Each structure stands twice: as structure tokens, then as C-alpha cells.
Amino acid sequence: MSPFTGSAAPTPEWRHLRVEITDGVATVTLARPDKLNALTFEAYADLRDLLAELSRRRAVRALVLAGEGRGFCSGGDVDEIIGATLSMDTARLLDFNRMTGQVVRAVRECPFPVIAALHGVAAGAGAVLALAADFRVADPSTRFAFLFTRVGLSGGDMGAAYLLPRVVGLGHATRLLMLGDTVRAPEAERIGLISELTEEGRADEAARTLARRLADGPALAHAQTKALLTAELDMPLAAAVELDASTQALLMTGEDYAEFHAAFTEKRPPKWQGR
Amino acid sequence: MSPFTGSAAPTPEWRHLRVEITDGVATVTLARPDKLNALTFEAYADLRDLLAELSRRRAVRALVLAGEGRGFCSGGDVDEIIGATLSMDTARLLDFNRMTGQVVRAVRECPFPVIAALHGVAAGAGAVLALAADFRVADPSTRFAFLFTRVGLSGGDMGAAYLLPRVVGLGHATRLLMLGDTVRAPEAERIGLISELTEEGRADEAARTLARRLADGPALAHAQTKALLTAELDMPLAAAVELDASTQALLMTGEDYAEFHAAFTEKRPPKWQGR
Amino acid sequence: SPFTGSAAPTPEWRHLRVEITDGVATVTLARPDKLNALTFEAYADLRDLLAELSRRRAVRALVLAGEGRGFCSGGDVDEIIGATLSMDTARLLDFNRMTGQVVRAVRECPFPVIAALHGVAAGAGAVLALAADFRVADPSTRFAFLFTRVGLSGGDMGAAYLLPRVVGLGHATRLLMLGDTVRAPEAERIGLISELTEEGRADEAARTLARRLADGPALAHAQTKALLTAELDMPLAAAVELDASTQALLMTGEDYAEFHAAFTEKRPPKWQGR
Numbered sequence: 074m075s076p077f078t079g080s081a082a083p084t085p086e087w088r089h090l091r092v093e094i095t096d097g098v099a100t101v102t103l104a105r106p107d108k109l110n111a112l113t114f115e116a117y118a119d120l121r122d123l124l125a126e127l128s129r130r131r132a133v134r135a136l137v138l139a140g141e142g143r144g145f146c147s148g149g150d151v152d153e154i155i156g157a158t159l160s161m162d163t164a165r166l167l168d169f170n171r172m173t174g175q176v177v178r179a180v181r182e183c184p185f186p187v188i189a190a191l192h193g194v195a196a197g198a199g200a201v202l203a204l205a206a207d208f209r210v211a212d213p214s215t216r217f218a219f220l221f222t223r224v225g226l227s228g229g230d231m232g233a234a235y236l237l238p239r240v241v242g243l244g245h246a247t248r249l250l251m252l253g254d255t256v257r258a259p260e261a262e263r264i265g266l267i268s269e270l271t272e273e274g275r276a277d278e279a280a281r282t283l284a285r286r287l288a289d290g291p292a293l294a295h296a297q298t299k300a301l302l303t304a305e306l307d308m309p310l311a312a313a314v315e316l317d318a319s320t321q322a323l324l325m326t327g328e329d330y331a332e333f334h335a336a337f338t339e340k341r342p343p344k345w346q347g348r
Numbered sequence: 349m350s351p352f353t354g355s356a357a358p359t360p361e362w363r364h365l366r367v368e369i370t371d372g373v374a375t376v377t378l379a380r381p382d383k384l385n386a387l388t389f390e391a392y393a394d395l396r397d398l399l400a401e402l403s404r405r406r407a408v409r410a411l412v413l414a415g416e417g418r419g420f421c422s423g424g425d426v427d428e429i430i431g432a433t434l435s436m437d438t439a440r441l442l443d444f445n446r447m448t449g450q451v452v453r454a455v456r457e458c459p460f461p462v463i464a465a466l467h468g469v470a471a472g473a474g475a476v477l478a479l480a481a482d483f484r485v486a487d488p489s490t491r492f493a494f495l496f497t498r499v500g501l502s503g504g505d506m507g508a509a510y511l512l513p514r515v516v517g518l519g520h521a522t523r524l525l526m527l528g529d530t531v532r533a534p535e536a537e538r539i540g541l542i543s544e545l546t547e548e549g550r551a552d553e554a555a556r557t558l559a560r561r562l563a564d565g566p567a568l569a570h571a572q573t574k575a576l577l578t579a580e581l582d583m584p585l586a587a588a589v590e591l592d593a594s595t596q597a598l599l600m601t602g603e604d605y606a607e608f609h610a611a612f613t614e615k616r617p618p619k620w621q622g623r
Numbered sequence: 624s625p626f627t628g629s630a631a632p633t634p635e636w637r638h639l640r641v642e643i644t645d646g647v648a649t650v651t652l653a654r655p656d657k658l659n660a661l662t663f664e665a666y667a668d669l670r671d672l673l674a675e676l677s678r679r680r681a682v683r684a685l686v687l688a689g690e691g692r693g694f695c696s697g698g699d700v701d702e703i704i705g706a707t708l709s710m711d712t713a714r715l716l717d718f719n720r721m722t723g724q725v726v727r728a729v730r731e732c733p734f735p736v737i738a739a740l741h742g743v744a745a746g747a748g749a750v751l752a753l754a755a756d757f758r759v760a761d762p763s764t765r766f767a768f769l770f771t772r773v774g775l776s777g778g779d780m781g782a783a784y785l786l787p788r789v790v791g792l793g794h795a796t797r798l799l800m801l802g803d804t805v806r807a808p809e810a811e812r813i814g815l816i817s818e819l820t821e822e823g824r825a826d827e828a829a830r831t832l833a834r835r836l837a838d839g840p841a842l843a844h845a846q847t848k849a850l851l852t853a854e855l856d857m858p859l860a861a862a863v864e865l866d867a868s869t870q871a872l873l874m875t876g877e878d879y880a881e882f883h884a885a886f887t888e889k890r891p892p893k894w895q896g897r
């Protein structure tokens with residue numbers, strides 16, 4: 074845990090999503106299965122604020138993002154978001170779109186791996202949240218749809234036009250984002266959108282197993298792996314090797330690197346501490 | 349379209365390529381099936397000048413790039429291009445190579461989607477033109493050859509070294525550009541070069557159908573999807589979400605977004621206007 | 624290239640095997656018994672050799688190979704890891720800078736680099752292969768980016784920059800974070816393999832590819848690599864400027880002119896690399 078806290082206290086209760094933490098693994102289950110977990114303004118606000126809170130306290134070592142019911146997440150609620158935005162002032166339109174983009178950025182920047190447990194529909198914001206995760210663990214019913222243009226918006230929504238070509242290549246990104254057609258599991262797997270394909274109904278269990286695998290590993294090493302992937306997407310080669318050099322040298326002063334060698338020489342399992 | 353015209357008038361007749369516009373869709377057909385549609389200096393000049401004139405008046409909602417005869421385009425005419433360049437002065441050599449790269453840039457930047465209808469060979473410049481398009485609609489005879497090195501020039505010609513790795517990955521791009529070997533339809537599909545694979549002989553019809561599909565949709569949403577994809581290839585994550593935020597907020601003030609919600613509430617199809 | 628000064632070429636390379644024939648350099652990693660595990664001195668030789676070969680433009684292609692049961696298992700657990708555990712801050716930084724500089728030097732060589740893969744390619748072995756322009760691999764090839772297995776991050780010596788640009792961010796995150804083995808079929812599917820050979824034929828296929836490249840127009844090949852590498856880090860408008868200058872320049876070269884001469888008279892072009 075991080076000692077760098079001040080006047081601000083942790084939120085006692087998260088009302089717009091379900092948050093459970095066990096042994097360093099957070100599980101965030103989207104609310105509203107009867108609506109395919111369609112997101113509201115308040116759910117975005119809780120995503121933003123929860124991630125900021127977990128990040129500043131270095132609270133967990135892995136996070137699973139899940140949805141109950143018939144699918145993962147259908148995106149923003151058509152009445153509670155879209156209908157409401159039709160009567161918002163200019164500043165509040167900008168604030169809403171900035172908030173969703175900073176949710177995706179917060180997923181990309183939080184000091185622990187994020188795993189999306191996917192099944193049925195992941196559409197609109199649901200598909201971008203999945204895309205921002207470090208891992209997508211998906212069952213065969215999983216259907217992505219980047220369908221912003223179908224509501225008259227651009228496919229550059231909350232980072233999708235930045236992330237998608239970096240995951241699947243520019244030719245596939247353009248097709249997916251401009252036409253908004255459904256991408257079923259086999260195509261998704263072929264083009265690079267799936268980290269682990271599971272058996273039908275097993276996505277949540279496999280996501281939990283992957284989370285625990287990561288949480289059992291060297292946390293600082295994992296978190297810095299994510300940090301360097303993310304930063305170096307936006308850096309030139311010469312700068313990337315400077316960040317690598319600094320980071321690897323720092324980690325070589327850590328307990329975990331020393332423990333690897335001690336365990337290796339003593340022919341036993343390493344016991345990681347994440348420092 | 350766009351009222352922002354001044355003293356400059358539209359070109360009445362395009363002489364070095366065939367241009368046809370029907371109901372917001374431009375079809376540009378390369379001339380010279382006899383010569384495998386090899387590109388002349390004037391053909392490049394007409395591409396440059398037509399895209400500029402289509403762009404500055406937002407004239408169309410989609411553009412198909414096509415080639416008659418046995419194949420899409422064999423590249424630069426060997427007698428008419430290479431032979432001529434061998435007696436050019438230093439400023440003209442630079443002018444020529446600037447113009448070709450400009451053409452590719454203009455394809456990436458024009459405010460409407462561009463579709464390449466591919467069959468037979470797309471080689472050299474013809475391969476790069478196809479690569480720059482937003483969609484590549486290809487029948488099974490389609491071949492790509494990025495074969496600049498075969499003529500003693502570098503494979504990073506007119507933007508190929510920039511675009512190809514962002515479409516197929518750095519490993520594949522290196523191999524394609526350094527060796528210049530033919531890529532046939534199955535490999536092209538595998539590595540991400542093909543947007544839609546058609547039956548033999550159906551590429552032009554399928555491209556037309558796709559263009560009409562795009563032209564029937566919300567044109568401003570499509571255009572911004574392309575602009576954001578293009579710009580965000582060259583931006584960091586934090587900047588990308590600021591561009592997404594301004595753009596989406598802007599589109600939420602548009603008629604097409606409002607019409608999506610109106611259509612939804614009356615359970616009817618949206619009638620898009622592109623504003 | 625004639626641009627040499629007080630500094631003389633290194634007479635003998637003790638920490639790897641270096642053989643040059645008709646413009647092709649073959650670099651064979653030492654220590655086949657230890658799966659060619661790297662020492663500090665092996666890294667130093669890679670750095671210093673690549674710098675010599677580059678400043679002289681001595682070679683038109685370079686093959687990176689390893690003998691024994693596998694390509695390269697990475698840094699030596701005793702001679703590197705063991706040693707690093709008692710190093711001071713400055714030397715820890717120095718070491719990790721050196722490894723990244725070797726990878727950068729591979730990306731910046733003015734000739735193509737080809738990795739001849741088979742068996743295990745792990746840790747630095749995986750990243751060295753990743754940095755090569757071509758990966759020529761037989762079906763036994765197994766990649767493992769296993770830095771996190773030793774408590775270090777997957778952003779070792781450029782891996783976090785290179786891998787997503789080769790296989791996509793989703794695959795790169797998986798590979799670098801879990802460090803699981805990637806066998807040949809998967810490697811092929813995700814874009815890590817340039818040419819898949821039959822068992823035991825990687826070194827031969829690599830030799831053949833190197834010669835194919837050394838037989839071609841060398842300036843065109845080198846600039847192809849230079850532009851690919853630079854343009855990964857440049858925006859589109861700047862990339863077409865670099866292409867413009869470069870193509871204009873190569874159009875003043877002998878090879879381009881030779882091509883028109885040749886292709887005209889239906890005789891094969893005879894390249895000169897200028």
C-alpha cells in the first residue's frame with residue numbers, strides 16, 4: 074500500500090458500480106444487467122474517481138472489469154446519456170466527453186493490470202473500455218461493435234481512434250470504426266483483440282484466474298511493464314531506451330530481482346514482494 | 349457541401365484520368381488499360397489537383413479509385429517517368445518526389461472516405477495509392493508489390509515506409525518493402541491489407557456498394573472518424589483524448605446526432621444530413 | 624566508406640565469432656553449451672562491432688546466429704544477474720544503457736540484419752531477434768520475453784517500444800507481461816516471423832537471404848531501413864519530406880540509372896550500391 078495520503082479520505086461506498094477487493098485483486102462489476110450494463114453519467118464518475126483512488130493508494134495488484142447479465146456493456150445509455158446531452162450547454166458537452174476520455178486514459182495509466190472479462194455485447198463505450206484494458210479474456214459469444222458513427226458521432230470517441238489502430242492495425246481500425254459492424258470472436262481473435270479465448274460461460278472465472286496469476290507475481294515489475302508500454306507508444310526509439318535504462322536499473326535495486334536470483338540458486342520458488 | 353470558394357474555379361474537364369460523380373460518390377478510373385494504367389506526370393498532377401478541388405468544396409461523400417483492364421495499376425510508366433527523370437535537374441527531382449508523396453498525403457487527409465477497387469496487380473505507386481485508401485475492396489486476383497528497390501530506389505517511397513508498418517506491422521512491412529516480393533490475396537488478407545474480399549470480378553461493384561453505403565450515412569461523422577484516425581497516429585494519448593473531446597462535443601451539437609435520438613424515440617430509421 | 628581517422632578497426636573479436644565473406648557478415652554468438660547466454664563482454668563486442676561495421680559501411684548484410692540447441696537464452700544468470708546484484712547505481716545504469724544501445728545499433732545499421740532462429744530465444748535473445756530486420760526461423764523456434772520472470776519489467780532494452788510496433792499492443796502486453804513461450808505457429812500468426820523454414824534449415828535460409836540482399840542495390844536497401852526506422856517516430860507530413868529528399872537523392876545514383884539502361888535492353892541490372 075502507498076503511504077502518500079493527506080486530507081482526502083477514501084470513498085466508503087461506491088453506489089454506481091460494484092467494487093470488491095480480495096487479496097489485492099479488485100473486481101469492478103458494472104451495474105444494471107437488465108439494461109446490458111448501459112453506462113450513466115454517475116457510472117463514468119465512479120469509474121474516474123475509483124481508478125484515481127486505487128491509483129493513488131497503490132491499493133490493488135490487479136483489476137477485473139466485468140458485467141453481469143446477457144452481455145458485458147452496450148455503451149452509453151440512449152436516454153440517460155444521449156437524450157440528456159441534447160439539452161446540455163457547450164461547457165457541459167465538453168466536460169462529458171473529456172470525462173469519458175480520461176476514464177480510458179486512467180485505465181491506461183493505473184499502476185496495475187486491468188483485465189476485461191468479456192461475453193455477449195461490448196458496444197460503444199463498452200468496446201472502448203475493453204480495448205483500453207491490458208487483457209481481454211473473452212468467451213465465444215463476445216461481440217465488439219465500435220458503433221459511434223451509428224449515432225452520428227465520430228469513431229474517435231474516448232481514445233478509440235488512438236488505441237484501435239495500435240492494437241489491430243490501421244486498415245482494420247478504419248473499417249471497424251467507420252462502419253460500426255459487429256466483430257465476432259473468431260475475427261476478433263484473428264485481428265488481435267483477444268488475449269485469451271475461453272469456453273462458453275467461463276470468461277469471469279478465467280479473468281479471475283488471470284488476475285490472481287498477476288497478483289501473485291512481482292507487482293512493481295508488472296506495473297512498470299505497463300507504464301513503459303503505454304509511455305513508449307508516444308516516444309521515439311532513442312528516448313525509449315533511456316526510460317528502459319532508468320527503469321531496469323531501478324528495478325535491479327529492488328527486492329524482487331534479488332529474490333529471483335536467491336531462489337534460482339537455492340532451487341526453490343521465488344516469493345515476490347512487489348518492491 | 350462547402351460555400352468557401354473564391355476566385356479559383358473548378359476544373360471543367362479532367363484529361364489524364366476519368367472522373368465521374370453521381371449523387372455524392374466520385375469514381376476516379378485510371379486511364380490506359382493498354383499500359384496497365386501506368387501513371388504519367390500528368391496523371392499525378394491531376395490526382396493532386398482533383399483531390400485539392402474535391403477537398404476544398406467538400407464535394408463528395410465518398411470516392412472510389414479504380415483501374416480498368418487486367419489490373420489496378422502497375423505503377424509509374426517506365427518510359428514516361430524513369431526515362432524522363434534521368435535528365436532532370438536537382439530541383440525537379442525534388443519537385444517530382446514531393447508531388448507523389450503529396451498525393452498520398454492528400455488521400456489520407458481528404459474529408460471523405462476513399463475506397464480502392466483492387467484486382468490484378470497493384471505495384472509500385474499503384475501499391476502505395478491502394479495502401480493510402482481508407483478501404484481496399486479486393487477480388488482474389490489482387491496482388492501487391494512494393495517493388496521500389498527493384499528499380500534501385502528505396503522502399504519508403506511516397507509514404508510507404510510510414511503507412512505500411514502502421515497497417516501490417518513492422519516485421520511484415522520491412523520484408524515487403526526491402527525485398528519487393530508479390531503479396532497475393534490470401535497473405536494480404538492475413539496481414540491486414542484487405543478490407544473486403546470479393547468474388548472474382550466483383551471488386552468494382554462491391555466498391556460501388558460500399559461507397560454508396562458510406563454516402564448514405566452521416567457524412568460529418570464519417571469524415572471526422574477519418575481525420576481523427578489520421579491525426580492520432582501522430583499524437584500522444586493525452587492529446588488524442590483532447591481532440592476526441594472537442595470533436596465529439598462538436599458533433600453532439602450537430603443535426604445527425606439529434607436525428608439519431610429523434611428517430612430512436614419514434615422507432616424509425618434516421619435520415620442523415622451530414623451536419 | 625572512406626571516412627576513417629585515428630581509430631583503427633579491431634583486429635580480433637574474442638567474445639563472439641565474426642566472419643565476413645563478399646559483403647556478408649556472419650556473427651555467431653559464443654558459448655553453445657550454455658545456450659549462448661550473454662556476458663557483459665559479449666554485449667560490449669556487439670556494441671563495438673556494430674559501431675565499426677556502421678562507420679565503415681563494410682558490409683551489405685549481417686546474419687546473427689547461434690550454434691547448439693538454441694539461438695540465445697538471454698543474459699547469463701550467474702555472470703550477469705549475479706554480478707549486477709553487487710553493482711553500484713552508476714554501473715547499473717551503465718549496463719542497462721549498454722543493452723538498449725545494442726538494440727538501437729541494430730535498428731540503425733546501414734545494412735539489413737537477419738536473425739537465424741531455432742530453439743530458445745529468450746530475454747535479450749528474444750529482443751535481439753525482435754530488433755533484426757528479418758527473422759528466419761525453423762519450426763522449433765520458441766520466443767520468451769521473460770523479464771518479469773526475473774523481477775524486471777518487460778521494457779528491457781527496447782522491447783516495449785519494438786514489440787507493439789511488430790505485433791500490436793494487445794499481443795505485446797500479453798507477451799511482455801506474462802513472459803509465456805511463443806512457439807512458431809503463433810509467432811507466424813502474430814507477425815514475428817519473416818520466413819518459416821524446415822527443421823535445421825534456418826542458418827542456410829538466412830545465408831541465402833543475406834546473399835540475396837548483398838546482391839541487390841545496397842544504398843536503396845539501406846535507405847529503406849533508415850526510413851522505416853525513422854518514420855516510426857515521425858508524423859505523416861514529415862515522413863513524406865524525408866521520402867522526397869531520399870528518393871530525389873537516389874535518383875541521382877548509378878543504380879537507378881543502371882536500372883533504366885538494363886531494363887531497357889532486357890539485360891539484368893548490375894547493381895553497384897551508389
Ligand SMILES: [Zn+2]
Nearest residue numbers: 239242514788
Ligand atoms: Zn501497429
Ligand SMILES: [Zn+2]
Nearest residue numbers: 306581582855
Ligand atoms: Zn506511432
